[PDB]
Amino acid sequence: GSLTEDGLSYKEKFVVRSYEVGSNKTATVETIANLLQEVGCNHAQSVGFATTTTMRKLHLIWVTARMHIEIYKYPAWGDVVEIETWCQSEGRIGTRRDWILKDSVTGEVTGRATSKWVMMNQDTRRLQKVSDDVRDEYLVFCPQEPRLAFPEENNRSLKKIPKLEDPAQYSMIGLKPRRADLDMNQHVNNVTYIGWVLESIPQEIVDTHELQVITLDYRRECQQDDVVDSLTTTTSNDSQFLHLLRLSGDGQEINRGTTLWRKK
């Protein structure tokens, strides 16, 4: 991987692995999300980091608030996928990381993704606005004019998601993270939540449809000793679902989302 000529974005190529593919012999959405995360981390390292100087002094971190992924073609086992990523400041609300996925052979766009990140104190877990000093320190690494993976004025990446009402149509109960689900700081990896959401989709939908769009809101973290319940209700040749992840016991919300599936 490497930064582009202007130093304002980063590209990396990946060969899709045997254990990374599902029943169709194409990469799962969780493999795609892990690749986005890896290219995101390599971009941050290449430019000096994603805690800045001022963030480390004030015990502040970036946390994912929302993730939105749209896939047109999942790469097959052995195929090479090229991913381009960049960051942008969104004033004092937070930051945004965007991605474009391309087939290395054809150069065609096979997917795109966007994510919203908010500032948070590591210790108190209290969200806050982006200070001027932090915003100035990361603007040297971002394009100045807007560059959006989802430019459309009526796009599905900015839609408000409602809370699923009991009773859910489908459910998968008692989901727990194992050590492979944790990152290097022992926090549950953001991609695990995508897997947990998809666990309540019936196997018949997965067998006859391909996942086209997934929007996920992150409300609260799952601790490594927590237990989660995954709930899904059909809201709809296309199928839409409303999703909810909550703690198995008290029912505390951890995530909410929507998925759109197209018939194969």
Ligand X SMILES: N#CCC(=O)NC1CCCCC1
Q: Which residues bind ligand X (CB under 6 A)?
A: 33, 36-37, 40-41, 64, 67, 97, 115, 190-191
E strand or H helix at 174: strand 170-175
- State yes or no: residue 21 binds its own copies (CB under 8 A): yes
Closest contact distance (angstroms) between CB of 255 and its own copies is: 15
Burial zone of 142 (CB within 10 Å; 0-12 exposed, 13-18 middle, 19+ buried):
middle
Closest contact distance (angstroms) between CB of 80 and its own copies is: 13
Separation of alpha carbons 37 and 264, rounded Å: 28
Separation of alpha carbons 112 and 198, rounded Å: 19
Count the neighbouring beta carbons within 10 Å of the beta carbon of residue 72: 13
Q: Based on CB atoms, which residue is closest to ligand X, 115 or 258?
A: 115
- State yes or no: residue 148 binds its own copies (CB under 8 A): no
E strand or H helix at 43: helix 29-46
Closest contact distance (angstroms) between CB of 69 and ligand X is: 8
Contact stretch for its own copies (CB under 8 A) within 40-48, 129-137, 160-168, 255-263? 40-48
Which option in ligand X, its own copies, none does residue 115 bind, with CB closer than 5 to 8 A by kind? Answer: ligand X
- Specify whether the CB–CB gap between 229 and 246 falls below 8 A: yes
- State yes or no: residue 245 binds its own copies (CB under 8 A): no
Q: End-to-end alpha-carbon separation of the chain, Å?
A: 33
- State yes or no: residue 198 binds its own copies (CB under 8 A): yes
Q: Which residues contact 144 (CB under 8 A, 6 or more apart)?
A: none
List the catalytic residues.
185, 187, 222
Residues lying near its own copies in the complex (CB under 8 A): 17-19, 21-23, 25, 28, 30, 34, 37-38, 41-42, 45, 77-78, 174-176, 178-180, 182-186, 189, 191, 195-196, 198-199, 206
